[PDB]
Amino acid sequence: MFEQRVNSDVLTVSTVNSQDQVTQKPLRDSVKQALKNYFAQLNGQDVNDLYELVLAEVEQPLLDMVMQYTRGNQTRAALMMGINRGTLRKKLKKYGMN
Template sequence: MTQTDSPTLTPESPGNELKNNFTQAPVASAQTLRDSVETALNNYFAHLDGQPVTQVYDMVLAEVEAPLLERVMKYTRNNQTKASVILGLNRGTLRKKLKQYDLL
């Protein structure tokens, strides 16, 4: 699924609430990434108020994958070969994902 295939999120939509939960997580916390995701999902599901929800997997993956790619690319000074080694991805796969998230 490409970023353009993702459902459009409005400020009040459940997807934006999940994004806010991720972005508001404390930086210097002893909480693991896994715990942060669990907390964000618990908050997300607790505030649905009966709204239908689909594509949670894609939504969570996009919220985690995009900043991961962005940070690794910054760390490697945009060297895709080094970034692909760090991420354990084929360079072609990395390029595809960078395009998917408009990072290339």
């Protein structure tokens, strides 16, 4: 009765294919494509912060959404993110989301 949903198809993005068909593709692929374009627009400059870069680029919307979902409730949000409430405040403050 239940068809398998693979971990990569849990967070997906609408894409358009060669037959103008709208299909869900993994978020993984978005991250992959962004990184491929990032490397391509690098031209040998030195990087030392790529993890923090990506992490910010991904943490901000996550906090935005879980806060919208919990209607400002940091405790449910923390419980739902699977992180400590203090950690959540830290992150929120880090991104000016207070």
